[PDB]
Amino acid sequence: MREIVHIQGGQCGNQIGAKFWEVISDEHGIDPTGTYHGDSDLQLERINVYYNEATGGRYVPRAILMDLEPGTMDSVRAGPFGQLFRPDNFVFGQTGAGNNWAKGHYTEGAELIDSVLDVVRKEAEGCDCLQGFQITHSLGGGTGSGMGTLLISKVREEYPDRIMETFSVVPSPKVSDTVVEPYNATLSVHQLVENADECMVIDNEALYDICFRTLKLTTPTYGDLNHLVSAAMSGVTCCLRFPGQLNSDLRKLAVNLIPFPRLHFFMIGFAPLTSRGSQQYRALTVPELTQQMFDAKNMMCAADPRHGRYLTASALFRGRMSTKEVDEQMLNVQNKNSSYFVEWIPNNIKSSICDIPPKGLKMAVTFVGNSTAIQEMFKRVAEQFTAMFRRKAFLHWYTGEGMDEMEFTEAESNMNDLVSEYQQYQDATA
Amino acid sequence: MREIVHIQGGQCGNQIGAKFWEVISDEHGIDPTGTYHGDSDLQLERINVYYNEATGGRYVPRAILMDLEPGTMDSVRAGPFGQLFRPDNFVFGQTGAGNNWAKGHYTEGAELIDSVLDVVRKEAEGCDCLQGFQITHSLGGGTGSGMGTLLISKVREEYPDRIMETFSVVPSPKVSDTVVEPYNATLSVHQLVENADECMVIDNEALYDICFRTLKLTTPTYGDLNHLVSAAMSGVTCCLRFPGQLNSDLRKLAVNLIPFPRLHFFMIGFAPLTSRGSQQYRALTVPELTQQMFDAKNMMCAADPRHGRYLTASALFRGRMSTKEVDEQMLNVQNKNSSYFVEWIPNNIKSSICDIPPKGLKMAVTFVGNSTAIQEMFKRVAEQFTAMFRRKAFLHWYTGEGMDEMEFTEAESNMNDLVSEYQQYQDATA
Amino acid sequence: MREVISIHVGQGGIQVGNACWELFCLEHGIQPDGQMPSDKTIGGGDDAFNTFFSETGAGKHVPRAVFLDLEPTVIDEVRTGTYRQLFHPEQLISGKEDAANNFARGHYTIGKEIVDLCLDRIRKLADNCTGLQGFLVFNSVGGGTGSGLGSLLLERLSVDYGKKSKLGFTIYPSPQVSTAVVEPYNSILSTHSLLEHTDVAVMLDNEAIYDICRRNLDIERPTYTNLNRLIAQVISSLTASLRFDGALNVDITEFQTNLVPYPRIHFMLSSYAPIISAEKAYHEQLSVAEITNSAFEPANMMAKCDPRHGKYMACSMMYRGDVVPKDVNASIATIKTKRTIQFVDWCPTGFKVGINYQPPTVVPGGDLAKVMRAVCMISNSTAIAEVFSRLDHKFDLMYAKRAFVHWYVGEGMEEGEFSEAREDLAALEKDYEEVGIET
Amino acid sequence: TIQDNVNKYRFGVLIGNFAEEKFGMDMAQRQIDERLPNSTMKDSYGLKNSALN
Amino acid sequence: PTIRNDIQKPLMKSIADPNNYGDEKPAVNLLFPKKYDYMGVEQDDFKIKRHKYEIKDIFEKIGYKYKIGKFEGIFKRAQEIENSTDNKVSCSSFLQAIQEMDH
Numbered sequence A, B: 001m002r003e004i005v006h007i008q009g010g011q012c013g014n015q016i017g018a019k020f021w022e023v024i025s026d027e028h029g030i031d032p033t034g035t036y037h038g039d040s041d042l043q044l045e046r047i048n049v050y051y052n053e054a055t056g057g058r059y060v061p062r063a064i065l066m067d068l069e070p071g072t073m074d075s076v077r078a079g080p081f082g083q084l085f086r087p088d089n090f091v092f093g094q095t096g097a098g099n100n101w102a103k104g105h106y107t108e109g110a111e112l113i114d115s116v117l118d119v120v121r122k123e124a125e126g127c128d129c130l131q132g133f134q135i136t137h138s139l140g141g142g143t144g145s146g147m148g149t150l151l152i153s154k155v156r157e158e159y160p161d162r163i164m165e166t167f168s169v170v171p172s173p174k175v176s177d178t179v180v181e182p183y184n185a186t187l188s189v190h191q192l193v194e195n196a197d198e199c200m201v202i203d204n205e206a207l208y209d210i211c212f213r214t215l216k217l218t219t220p221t222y223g224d225l226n227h228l229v230s231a232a233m234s235g236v237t238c239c240l241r242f243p244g245q246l247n248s249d250l251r252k253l254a255v256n257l258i259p260f261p262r263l264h265f266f267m268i269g270f271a272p273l274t275s276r277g278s279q280q281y282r283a284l285t286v287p288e289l290t291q292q293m294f295d296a297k298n299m300m301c302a303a304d305p306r307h308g309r310y311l312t313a314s315a316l317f318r319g320r321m322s323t324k325e326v327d328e329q330m331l332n333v334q335n336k337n338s339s340y341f342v343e344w345i346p347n348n349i350k351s352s353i354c355d356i357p358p359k360g361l362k363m364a365v366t367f368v369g370n371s372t373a374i375q376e377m378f379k380r381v382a383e384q385f386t387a388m389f390r391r392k393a394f395l396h397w398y399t400g401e402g403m404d405e406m407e408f409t410e411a412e413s414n415m416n417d418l419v420s421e422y423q424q425y426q427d428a429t430a
Numbered sequence C: 001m002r003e004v005i006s007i008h009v010g011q012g013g014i015q016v017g018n019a020c021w022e023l024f025c026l027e028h029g030i031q032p033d034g035q036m037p038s039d040k041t042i043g044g045g046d047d048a049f050n051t052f053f054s055e056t057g058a059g060k061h062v063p064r065a066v067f068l069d070l071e072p073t074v075i076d077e078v079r080t081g082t083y084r085q086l087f088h089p090e091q092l093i094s095g096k097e098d099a100a101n102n103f104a105r106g107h108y109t110i111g112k113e114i115v116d117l118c119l120d121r122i123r124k125l126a127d128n129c130t131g132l133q134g135f136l137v138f139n140s141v142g143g144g145t146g147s148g149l150g151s152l153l154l155e156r157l158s159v160d161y162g163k164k165s166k167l168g169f170t171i172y173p174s175p176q177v178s179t180a181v182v183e184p185y186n187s188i189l190s191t192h193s194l195l196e197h198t199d200v201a202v203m204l205d206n207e208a209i210y211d212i213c214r215r216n217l218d219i220e221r222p223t224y225t226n227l228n229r230l231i232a233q234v235i236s237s238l239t240a241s242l243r244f245d246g247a248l249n250v251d252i253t254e255f256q257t258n259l260v261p262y263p264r265i266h267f268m269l270s271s272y273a274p275i276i277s278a279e280k281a282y283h284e285q286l287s288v289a290e291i292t293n294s295a296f297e298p299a300n301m302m303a304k305c306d307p308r309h310g311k312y313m314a315c316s317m318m319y320r321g322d323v324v325p326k327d328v329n330a331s332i333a334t335i336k337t338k339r340t341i342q343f344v345d346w347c348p349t350g351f352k353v354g355i356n357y358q359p360p361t362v363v364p365g366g367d368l369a370k371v372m373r374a375v376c377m378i379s380n381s382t383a384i385a386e387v388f389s390r391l392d393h394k395f396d397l398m399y400a401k402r403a404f405v406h407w408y409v410g411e412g413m414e415e416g417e418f419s420e421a422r423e424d425l426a427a428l429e430k431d432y433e434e435v436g437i438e439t
Numbered sequence D: 001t002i003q004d005n006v007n008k009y010r011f012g013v014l015i016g017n018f019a020e021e022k023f024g025m026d027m028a029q030r031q032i033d034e035r036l037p038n039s040t041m042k043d044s045y046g047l048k049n050s051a052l053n
Numbered sequence E: 001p002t003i004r005n006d007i008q009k010p011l012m013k014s015i016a017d018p019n020n021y022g023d024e025k026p027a028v029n030l031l032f033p034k035k036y037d038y039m040g041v042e043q044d045d046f047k048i049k050r051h052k053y054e055i056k057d058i059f060e061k062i063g064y065k066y067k068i069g070k071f072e073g074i075f076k077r078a079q080e081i082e083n084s085t086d087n088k089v090s091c092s093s094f095l096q097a098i099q100e101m102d103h
């Protein structure tokens, strides 16, 4: 019941999805060698949310794995906990994207996306009552921006009722991994806004900033970064797997957070997070978690809220707690910082509670942010795009694969339109 | 009927109060659990003067314990007989007056005093018909005086016709316990003399002398000191809660003991007193009881009883004993002490007979009289006051909470005038 | 022979429904096993379990309850909970998808696929009952499922049965301690559904309970278990008269004729006392003298509305324990003497009195210990206008420029409907202003 | 953050953070209590506080 | 230590001895001697049981005499209240049995 699906594409998508599946297997009690070694009966009560059943009591995850380059499929399969995934879910080509959007949505994808749609349709229809889709992809890369988005349009057109989830790691001007990052990402925003109901961007440069400052670890690596995100989206779907005092589902989250259809962009975070130095010197109560939650540096996106004002924000607490403290703390933060919350909407904070926290901590908090600070993120990329496009640098690759500059100009116009329409409310007053 | 409530303020009042309350119960057999275990009817005939009832049939005393610091109460209730008191009456501050008259009287005392007055007002109204209150405190405590006086003041301003009784300890300079005793001791006199209808002073120093000499015990403790006082209070009200040959309520004692309006300072003593080494020789008789009463070691005030003249005196004989020799002894006493008795007011001896003696003994006698001998104490305390003021040493604190040197000048002259006015009748002749 | 069918819908009701039954279970001696062994009593006693339980012929008792919710999450815990063997196996209606806190979803599209089972269950339930006196329904107004399915269910009953009186306990958003962001929308449209359809409404706002819990229980970290306990008491508080011997029994039918002067003015607020924990109780006296006095304390009211800000329109009280009735009159008379509490000009007699002997039952492990007396105060006053006003003020700001409207619009509900809500909600307010005027 | 760290060194030399790595140097071998608590609804309305006691 | 409770004290007081062996009674006890302290008997004297041959002799001396058979029966019920293995009875323990007795 209320089961969902997961589609991960591109290298980043595969990495994040593998980490998330590892975390979920840990939480539920699934072993590589698949049999059940969980203890609490509560875990098996609703295990059907993210898993089917197969002959021999071996659980399989309803994931979809796809990409246009062979290594990514081969690498995740070789590593532990990649052996849970269904090989039949493996689909791929032998060409490669090479950081070319058109290579990812017009020429090659059309020939291979036919197979992928069939697998997703069959798997989805298999279950009883869907609840939505949560997709992991990247906008600054080649494969992820195009292949996933094309999948997005087709899936949304086919199934116009169920909501969708997306995890995008937008690039930032601090650390760059591609010299053409603005283009494929900028064109990505043009198509995604019309279909993707919920989007929760993720920024790498915040990862290093959060990794270096709060964690204080000397030498972090990719495993460290990927791990955090798995926590956030595992917590976003906590009440739907476990009982609680006030259950809150995906549809509940969107309804309380999106005022208008064009403003559906969020930023998230995770807590509690403690440096290795001071682990055991601090407690576990609503006060500390709520204080760390709203911190500027605790967020998971490059946007800094203090230059913007939140419209709607929801808190999905985990584990037992005293509710009155939950309510009292939320109001206190609301009242002491009226300048940061717009006025014409009263009670612009939501709450929720669940009875089971992650293994190894008394409680934890997952936070979703919808504030005007997301305007800056798009603005900087727009700045790069115009400079790169005026001289038409690197434009010949994309002009030579059926694309037209009309689409580029339309996308560039659209991004500015969304930026303006989203920054309007900051100065708009009742 | 015509009962009273019992109220404590400051550190001293608390310690004395516990003793007296434990003193009263065992006399009627009120066990700590609140279930009656007395034997005779008289132990239950008039339980109203000091106790009420609730659900369950247990008895609680209408005492509202007050203090400005938590430490004393956390222990006092932690000690024996900490289970009879209503916790609803526990109201206390968090900072502590710091033995500063300024702090506990105008700045902090004013704020917290609202609660006690509401509870004090609440308790008084509930009775069928109230007579007066009794307050125990010491002038040597900054916290005690501050809250205590206002409670003394406001209550009287609220109820004019009731009988206000206070038993304060004036610190003689022989046993000094604090640097700022001379200041706070004097000021509290200013207000209390104006409003306090009756005053019965007791000296800690005189307490020691009686304990060391009469009791002949090697090492006395606060339990021994305050336990003695508890006896006197019981003899103070002893005539009020039992049948007696000559009943005399607190008001009646007021009529016979204050010839003039402002002369309302009293000193009392309890007899008989015997030493365990001397227990089994003395001859408990009216003959023996009287002789102890008029000795200088019978009276708990440092001022020498033969250093003036007695305005009026009364004694509430405790236990069953005919009066014939009582009256003849009284005139016997009066004639052979006539040279010390003021000449213009004849018949200055009062006698009252109560058949109920303290448990464990046969006969009991208490002393309450008004003598010119109280003049010295104010002099010794007043003299110390002048020395401090000349250099204004330690006066800065009081100025720091709104006090002004004008008020300090006003209080002393009012005190000094009292001494002169009191000794004014000392040389008066008919 | 005198029975009342209970209706529970929505997350908010379910747990409060959970609390009410347990105490109901305790008061009769029916252990969760489904039996009432008692002191080996088999036929040697009265038949009082009718009011809330029915005999199966041999052994167990089946509660007269129907449970509704669109998310199986809440039902599952009860179905596998500590009372798994009591409720009827199939009368626990379970949904498929969550109402997602949207009225349009809960009233026009997904709520129309489950009502058929609800009515079928109720119709059969009424068949067993012979002395149906009314209906008691617990629901939440700040949730799409709550207001939606509850409103539709109540409407269905209105025509199906009609004259049968209805008493419903709702839970409006707190004045300031509020969680949902779209809760006001669902509330107002919920008010329209129940405004002209329900008979007696008992405000049961949440924030008021917290202060009552904190201040008197002296608890600083209360949980949802504590609040549910208080509500179950009042629910058991109001109806306990019909099933136990009392000096002046009062039937649920005797509220519409004694507490609602006018057809549209039928919104009322509750309060409870005495409230004492298991630590500081035996040293306090608990007399009819002050217990009644405390019940009128504004800070002790079960709703966040100051009774000092409006006149009193009609009152009703029930006494329990060993109360001597003459003690009842004495407490009332002085209250009239006090000038702080004032009534309206057109209500000469505004105190309805009832005395039931039985003492309130104590569920071990709780907060309220065994006292020998208590009183339930249920009164309708014109002061409740403010709370409706405050919700209205919230609506105007968040509806001036179509806040979250498209979510509700797309589900099918017409845009002009909201204009209907504002008209009705404000119309009631303007109705209340006139009522308080003096003759 | 964005600026490099000049000193790398091995461990033992309390240069740079040094202390932070030590804190947790045991926590790698420090155990964590596993298992999942027993919910809230199942906590209050248990078999106790019923007609069984 | 403050109070010399481990020095064994002198069997004769020196009237000027300034140390305390712990046998002195604090003022809480002093003000309320145990009733019969004024005639040389302490209350821990009825809690020492005595034998019937001497218990009786105590009882004919007072003036309370009971015939054999009735004396033996009353004594036994006194022991029955005692519920002690030793045949000796608590003299006061017989003082409660009489009150309930005599009817």
Ligand SMILES: Nc1nc2c(ncn2[C@@H]2O[C@H](COP(=O)(O)OP(=O)(O)OP(=O)(O)O)[C@@H](O)[C@H]2O)c(=O)[nH]1
Pocket: A245, A246, A247, C009, C010, C011, C012, C013, C015, C016, C069, C070, C071, C098, C099, C100, C101, C140, C141, C142, C143, C144, C145, C146, C171, C172, C173, C179, C180, C183, C206, C224, C227
């Ligand atoms: N006092 C109290 N209020 C509750 C409780 N459960 C739900 N509520 C109320 O319900 C409101 C939010 O609605 P939900 O938590 O979504 O429950 P619902 O009304 O059934 O709505 P759905 O989740 O769609 O089923 C809150 O504002 C609460 O006032 C409860 O156990 N106690």
Ligand SMILES: Nc1nc2c(ncn2[C@@H]2O[C@H](COP(=O)(O)OP(=O)(O)O)[C@@H](O)[C@H]2O)c(=O)[nH]1
Pocket: A010, A011, A012, A015, A097, A098, A099, A138, A140, A141, A142, A143, A144, A145, A169, A171, A176, A177, A178, A204, A207, A222, A225, A226
């Ligand atoms: N946070 C994080 N980002 C990654 C990781 N691996 C790759 N990326 C990001 O993904 C981008 C490359 O996208 P890419 O996989 O080449 O897209 P594709 O060519 O369509 O498959 C780079 O800019 C990286 O910033 C990772 O392990 N963690």
Ligand SMILES: Nc1nc2c(ncn2[C@@H]2O[C@H](COP(=O)(O)OP(=O)(O)O)[C@@H](O)[C@H]2O)c(=O)[nH]1
Pocket: B009, B010, B011, B012, B015, B016, B098, B099, B138, B140, B141, B142, B143, B144, B169, B171, B176, B177, B178, B204, B222, B225, B226
């Ligand atoms: N008899 C007696 N006197 C006391 C006791 N405690 C304090 N005092 C007297 O109180 C005086 C100082 O009072 P203080 O400590 O300032 O009172 P506080 O401010 O309420 O704590 C000293 O001179 C003592 O003689 C006590 O237990 N018994």
Ligand SMILES: [Mg+2]
Pocket: A247, C010, C011, C071, C098, C145
């Ligand atoms: Mg719900």
